[PDB]
């Protein structure tokens, strides 16, 4: 039931839609075309599926489309140096879980789990499950991963049976802002943001007041680990937090400027 | 209507107001259960709180324009979004869970509307509307406020459907916020009742206050301006309540309880009131400065955004603290 | 997503009366009484007889308004009903000859999507002109439905009502225009105001008379008819009259004692009114006229049941509609009795509501539970014993001991009725004549008395037989002489006998003789020797109506065989080897609903029954049931054209058929040994039974029903539990007393706790130092709470234990704890002070009732009200205000706490299964705990965070939890132990929703059907209206089948008022409204058996399961009815 597996892991949509890159898609993640023309997409679907559809198909249509994608994906595995060994090593149910992975992170990304796949071949299932959880693949999409991993481990579809309605989900995070505390940034960028914020800040407070915040911020202890650049960028970010906080409280109190 | 709960419970089983007494007991009790701190910050910068549409997540705006969503059950951060270039000052998701309204402090756009299905992106911006809010009955339109002016837009076209302002009747209220009545037929702006279809000003209420614009009671029968409760039909003054002075007033989902939250210029407490007769239920004193609060639709949790430390100190560390409604700590508990 | 599969059916319809109205609804000529019982509407014709039942219908809604009206141009009344869910309809009663149907004349839903429902609830009034219907549904609004005949959808229109808190409202009589008159409340006081209702402008105009300032507690307005007009206004201390500028006030002291709550016009002149108050007193309100109103006068008439509503019918007969007690038909007399009462009860109508608590007990027999309920409210409070079975109407009883046999015998050929009866005693025989009603000894000569009679009766050719231990004796009638006589050749003893009109088969040891009855002759036809000794015989002629049977049923010794032999050859046609090694004692051939069976009861209570083919003798479809221990005697009787088999044993049973499935129904008697039918001139369609001491004669009912025995208490029962080991019940009760000038309290009437055989009062000093609260005042009421010890047989109050002053008894358990072998009554209490918001004090008190005395074993002071207690693995689990606490019973016999749980608003309800604990909350619906025994504390497994105001809870199984809440809905929660995260694992998902329309106070596992040898589990439940329901589980296979059946039934069944069944059963609160899921409406499924077979065919079309015909599903639904 690899179709049903991916109906729950990836989702099924019956009307044409756009994926996260803006490309036109149908069924279970079946890319129709990268063209921006919906009519170019509606004709690729109209040739793929037998009839004229106007961009709407029924589940039986989508599975026919899905199985060819699976057919196309196994041909990619069957022609891979790092994946053909272990694809032949598994029964139907457990290879449908490796097809699940190449659908997610590309067949080249799956090829990364070198020692994870070595254990699978050797049919060492429990040990492969534990090393598979130590990947960002697991830590980013833990729901999907631990249900595919239970398929690798036991050769059943049990992680897919009688499930409950999915808990409320929320869109993926944006790319972190420049002042994110683990993604690095530059000093001009930090310096410009202070300059920008100060346009607004100087309308409400004196420069002596704003210097007091700069002083207050730079007189706190820093990482003995930090470079002088990293320490200065840290002072700018704290300054911006403090000042934006003071602006927020000022407007709440009432700004007559 | 026996005063003692145990007498009311017995009478219910055999001889069925008592709901008012039940609310006085329930909505006088708040025990804190969780604190949410901004990840990777020694001093949290939360400014705004609201619950997810299915309230699985607590939505927390930050002083730098970010919107950070936390799993309520686990406290772990689930997602972060970049919304504005200044502190988030207001949040309002749609009931269906598809859209979200935000409001900033000084950056432009002040307010915006965001999608929440698969990609968190801007749908439309309301460049100079400092406050923004959905229509009540059908969440099809957006009402924003620019000073004394009210703007109404459509949540799909984005275009300004109409503009409500009358310089002759206006009160120039400090904290003016335009809003719909529960039927979307009326709009109150700056203390002036408007008829939406005719775009005509129905009535101007008298100004006994400088800041507060006013809200519609969810019962469709009253209009609450600061400390003054006006009959929506006759325009007569029904009650005067000094406790509501200058308080942001929220209603619970069923509209039977009214929250209100306020040297240092901010407040340390929030009050609850029986929504049906405005008698005060309790005054819950947090020891900290408060900047926002919100309830869920289940009357289970109350999220309050509290400044850590001394009140007059005004430290930067501002967290969000969850309370469980109707729940208290006993002496035997604290061991 | 997940889903549950539950099914819920009504065991007892609601019995409380929510409203009653009078008028001319079935025809213009006769007088109807209409009763509303929450969901059912009962129509009666008023007679000198009492009430003639005419038609009972049900609705997909709770009847909130019910008022008759006559539009001009209509020949008889129409009925307006408004549903609690705001379904509105107008109804007409049409009798198409033999068939009766209530047709929906107009219908619609009048709901404002923004509305604050009023304090005093829905009010519905109709003006004297029948020109409008007025609804007060919400505050500040007055809905109006114009009544001109175009308005087939009940299109309404609201009028903005300035006054926002209206107490009561009525349309006035004798007004220029339609005018409402209402009491309303504002900060100045409460007042009476009038408005005119402009129907053509759709607004209010200034009313006829000004407003006045009425009593603080004025609560009902009465519209006085012409010529007087105006309004009477009832309060707690005054009754006032108001008109143009006329006004009068009386304040009789008599009415201050209790609040008047309902009223009724006696005469159309409006000169007299009935008033009922909350302690049951019935008053006459008389308006004195001169002509104009001179004065008002109240006169006490007597006492009725606490009346929810009153209606004077005719000739001084008053219907008292009660919901706290039994409804009544009552007569007002011109003359008072000894006591000075004019009120004499004529007829009592059973009301089980409110069911405050209940329990199931196997008192009399084993395997068939009875319900024992705490019912009624104050002076109406009672225990109700609910038993399933068939009841006999005793009409005679003679103490003639030691009967071995009994037969109805006709004496005179010229008459058609049994007017003699013969009895067998060990060794000899007597005959009695049955003239009139009372019997006296005779003997018809030709009958012996020195030997034991084995049979006698009417045989062919106008003559009578009697078979004894040593003779078959045949006796002609008109001369009445011994006319023929048979005897075994060597004169041995006749062991077994059997006979019918034309045939005799008798056994002597292993021999059988077949003899025919011809004029003046016993012709021996054939003889045989059976393999083994003969135990029992039957030659009942079945089927193709001959009177002469080709078959002989026989049961034998030493091989437990039932054999069907062919007469006269005695050919073996069938040999069924039965189980065991005890003899068959009674074998019988009968026909149930045109289908032949062979019945054969063995000694050890067991009874097989086969399908018998009366042409080939085949025995098929062997089935076995057990009917006691004393060996069973089978004996046949017919009712109208049906036939039944009465099975005499230590547990008497009646066997009949219902849709071709046999019923085995308990008989409400002690132990019947021998039985016969008897249609005498003085006992038509009756029976005759012999209980080993007495011989009783009476009438039996057709089908089995629920039978209710009432134990009055004259107090409020609150909780009940059963102690098997001391063969008594524990019952918590309270009575109301009033403070007097002595400083103490006085009861209003004797009652269970004041008239116990023995009694005690609490010695506890446990709340001495604690604060002295607000003192009580003279004339004010207080509650005195009592533990009652009630004997399981006599239901006498053996002992009454009075609790402390101001102490409420809240919860009760009977159990043993720890290593202690004693069984205790454990009581949870609260110190309830009326000014205090919540009890902060309480007790858990361990009693034991041993050797007729109650002792206090132990005591524990707690810090709040003990709402619930459960025996939990030899430990005491209790809820004290918001904490759940587990107690251990030490070897010193004191309670010592093991662990606490604190995540509650108010922990009201507790149930347990294994180590799991279900907690029900005031507002935050339900919560699952587990006792972790290797840590000795609680683990919180999962919660439901939705705001369901719980009223009762129940564990259906380890994963499924049943809830009832204050909006009359049911729901089911599931845990998912097999969930991949702790967030999932710790959330109970609501997977079942259903609007019951009742308010549930108690669940408990049990069944009122005997169960020996389609449906899993049995949870009974009791409601405020006295309705008793049943919840059970289904497989997904069955749920899908019956869910399909339901939607098909809904297209075919017409609903009164045209209410959609899915709208009625939709889960509905002021927070959300959702369609039902996971619940089969068993009442809808069962109504399948009542539709016409055309309708039945239309439902079954296009349907398959393990096609599907109409007959397949009659077998399904009939099987379903047997769970209750
Ligand atoms: Zn400023």
Numbering used by the authors:
A (entry chain C): -165 to 91
B (entry chain B): 1046 to 1061, 1067 to 1312, 1327 to 1399
C (entry chain A): -1 to 288, 295 to 1017, 1023 to 1115, 1123 to 1140
Text from the published report:
The Vpx/Vpr family of lentiviral accessory proteins usurp the substrate receptor DCAF1 of host Cullin4-RING ligases (CRL4), a family of modular ubiquitin ligases involved in DNA replication, DNA repair and cell cycle regulation. CRL4 consists of a Cullin4 (CUL4) scaffold that bridges the catalytic RING-domain subunit ROC1 to the adaptor protein DDB1, which in turn binds to exchangeable substrate receptors (DCAFs, DDB1- and CUL4-associated factors). CRL4DCAF1 specificity modulation by Vpx and Vpr from certain simian immunodeficiency viruses (SIV) leads to recruitment, poly-ubiquitylation and subsequent proteasomal degradation of the host restriction factor SAMHD1, resulting in enhanced virus replication in differentiated cells.
Vprmus adopts a three-helix bundle fold, stabilised by coordination of a zinc ion by His and Cys residues on Helix-1 and at the C-terminus. Superposition of Vprmus with previously determined Vpxsm, Vpxmnd2, and VprHIV-1 structures reveals a conserved three-helix bundle fold, and similar position of the helix bundles on DCAF1-CtD. Vprmus binds to the side and on top of the disk-shaped 7-bladed β-propeller (BP) DCAF1-CtD domain with a total contact surface area of ~1600 Å2 comprising three major regions of interaction. Moreover, side chain electrostatic interactions of Vprmus residues R15, R75 and R76 with DCAF1 E1088, E1091 and E1093 lock the conformation of an “acidic loop” upstream of BP blade 1, which is also unstructured and flexible in the absence of Vprmus. Additionally, Vprmus side chains R15, R75 and R76 neutralise the DCAF1 “acidic loop”, precluding the formation of further salt bridges to basic residues in SAMHD1-CtD.
